[PDB]
């Protein structure tokens, strides 16, 4: 049994221009994302030969 | 020390028969092997993206980025195992045959079990006689015997091999699992069924083991409520070192097991049905 | 050295019953394996990523070309600890004899420690079967010099991680952490409220009780009646030398004495929590 | 208690000669291992994911994005593991001036429709000109199953592979055939010019009992007709007996045989490229 | 790897203990290892320290 957890915190950001006079525009973005995550397993064997 | 008389009764599991035809002895080994692994992990990813975009336009559009991760996987492994290897290295003579039955041997009353061998070389011929199911007697040497009302126990989870103690929860008296060996009980049975009562609750009156609607175990004031009530699996005397089970008169599906819950861990949960070990204490 | 007398009481786990009905005797192996493996890692990875697009633009044709440079370092430690016991037993079961084991699980009262018991016998067959369920037996156990509470002087060592119970300052209070120091004294008191862990090492004097605060962290005390500093054991007096202790809070009675990471110190009391703790008395 | 004569053909198979032409002589340990290991599994996973997202912007720039989300997963796996092994091992002293040869043959009985391994030691002075055993053929005489009689002794009708009995069952309102433990289905095999035909003691429709392939390929019974479906051509020459490992191949669409397959509600078809094999048991 | 074969005479008992014994001031340790056979019967000694 896998039992998986994940939080994922991303913030974002666009500086931009445009009609802006000499045509043509300049971008900038910026993001950072922070991602947790716990996974538990169990796991159980039985066995026999003979 | 008592010492009760009862029938065990083993039925057929297993065979086996080997013919040694020929005029030279064969030297037969029998090997049998049960074993189990029981593996646990926790895994713990923490992981850091930074992204830096930029983009150029006018047309002709020029982009550029530049990304950072930063990862850390922590992960713990628990492994346990174990396994019972049985040999047996037996010479049959010329003209024989080996005969081998495996039974499951039940002891009647006292609730446990074992494997039952039974390996036999013969002349070839006569007529084979198969055991599939015998009875035979035994003296079993039994526990001192937990007298309801009377007797103090202690009760144990056999599986995670600590005790039931009392601790305060939302102002109630409430069962968790714990290491200490000073929290005693006392069984009782009435014609409603089984009450476990503490003897070590910090509020008074406060000592009878119930199921809360949500699944908890608290005490309570002893009162008629089926909810306080609990049903065994096997029927009196119950005795010390007795396996038992603990279902719920109330809600009848569920019974008494370990959870990791949010403040204790001992509760009453659906289908699931908990071993526990009675001890009297000495 | 002082000596008690106990009942040991031991009770059936498990059996198995051999007949050997023919008339040449066989030659019996039981091979019994129980062990545990732990392992731990950490992986840490770094990835640097640089990226160059463009698009040429005017129907309508557009043309892009992109480009990628990816770094990656994984960086990875892991460390197995295994043990095992294995344990054999090799017998000669004579013609018409039964062989029978039965394996107990024996409690030594008042001691607090318990042994596998293992009981093998080769028999006839025919009689009937004697099986024993539970079993009674006397043991003179010899014990440890006496923590007389109070007085004689302790060390408390955390049972799991073999590290002692160290005093140190958080936040201006002496605090409780773990540490390799056997330079560490405690004394052990027992009133109306339950029990005291007293340090001899402490930075401030007269802040020597070890106490829970509402956040978990063991910080010690000046003495009050407050249940916060008292602390509930797991056996019968009296405390003796390599006695495996438990505390419990007196006060917040869900939790006890632990081991967790914390910020700044390592030792706790928090719900469902209670590790194991060795006293042993200093010379 | 019935036996009957017969050829069992050997054949060459794997062949090696050893030869010792010191004077101190040798220790040979030949070791021969085959086996098998079948493993099945089974992984269920469930995941669930919640996201909350937002942008803040300005038009008439500036743009602030901000989300996060929530992922729950649950992985269930079952893993079944069997396996066997046979292993043969012989030693033998060579003595100086000796060659050692081995023969491996594989003898298949005739008639009786079963083989074994066949393998030939010897251990010679060096020296004359070697006879090696391409085939070999033998007499032998095999004790024999109790007659199938066609028409008349009941039998059962095992899987081979499964070890569980084919049984009938109710499907649309049709008798089926379906896989089971009951050892309570019997059955009758009849023979005729247009083949073999399975015919069923434990029907629910009086009537509806000889086993036929529907057209989607599920194994239903049907009153005895002249038509094709309901006849079989076996692997075996007659006649059959208790034990017989057969073959159903169905005489109307040949391309097809009797098998097992996990169908919508019974498992016992007739589909394409499939022949299972199946254990014929007399009762009583 | 530590492995110990013992032949256990017929209606004798084998006692195993395991200490962990501790060398005071001098800051070591070590393993102890207690076997004894005796004839069954008796009062059991228990070594905890
Ligand atoms: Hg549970």
């Avoid at chain 1, 991303?10 to 300049?26: N, P």
């Avoid at chain 2, 009162?223 to 109330?250: C, E």
Wanted: hydrophobic residues 30%.
């Amino acid at each position: 049994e896998t039992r998986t957890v994940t939080a994922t915190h991303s913030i974002g950001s666009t500086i931009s221009t445009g009609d802006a006079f000499e045509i043509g525009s300049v971008e900038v973005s910026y993001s950072h994302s922070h991602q947790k995550s716990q996974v538990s397993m169990t796991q159980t064997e039985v066995y026999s030969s003979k | 020390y008592e010492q009760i008389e009862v029938d065990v009764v083993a039925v057929w599991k297993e065979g086996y028969v080997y013919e040694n035809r020929g005029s030279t002895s064969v030297d037969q080994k029998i090997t049998i092997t049960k074993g189990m692994k029981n593996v646990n992990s926790e895994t713990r990813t923490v992981t850091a993206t930074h992204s830096i975009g930029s983009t150029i336009s006018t047309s002709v559009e020029v982009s550029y980025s530049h990304s950072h991760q930063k990862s850390q996987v922590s992960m713990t492994q628990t492994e346990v195992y174990s396994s019972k290897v049985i040999e047996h290295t037996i010479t049959i003579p010329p003209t024989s045959k080996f005969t081998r039955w495996q039974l499951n041997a039940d002891v009647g009353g006292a609730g446990i079990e074992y494997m039952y061998l039974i390996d036999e070389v013969t002349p070839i011929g006569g007529t084979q006689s198969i055991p599939q199911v015998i009875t035979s007697r035994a003296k079993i040497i039994v526990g001192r015997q937990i007298i309801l009302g009377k007797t103090e126990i202690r009760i144990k989870h056999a599986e995670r091999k600590e005790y039931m103690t009392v601790v305060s929860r939302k102002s109630w008296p409430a069962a968790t699992l714990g290491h200490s060996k000073l929290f005693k009980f006392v069984l009782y049975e009435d014609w409603g069924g089984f009450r476990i009562k503490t003897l070590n609750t910090m509020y008074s009156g406060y000592e009878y083991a119930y199921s809360s609607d949500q699944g908890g175990i608290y005490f309570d004031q002893g009162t008629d409520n089926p909810k306080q009530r609990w049903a065994i699996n096997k029927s009196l005397p119950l005795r010390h070192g007795d396996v038992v089970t603990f279902m719920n008169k109330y809600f009848t599906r569920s019974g008494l097991c370990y959870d990791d819950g949010p403040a204790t861990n001992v509760y009453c949960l659906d289908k699931r049905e908990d071993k526990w070990i009675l001890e009297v204490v000495g």
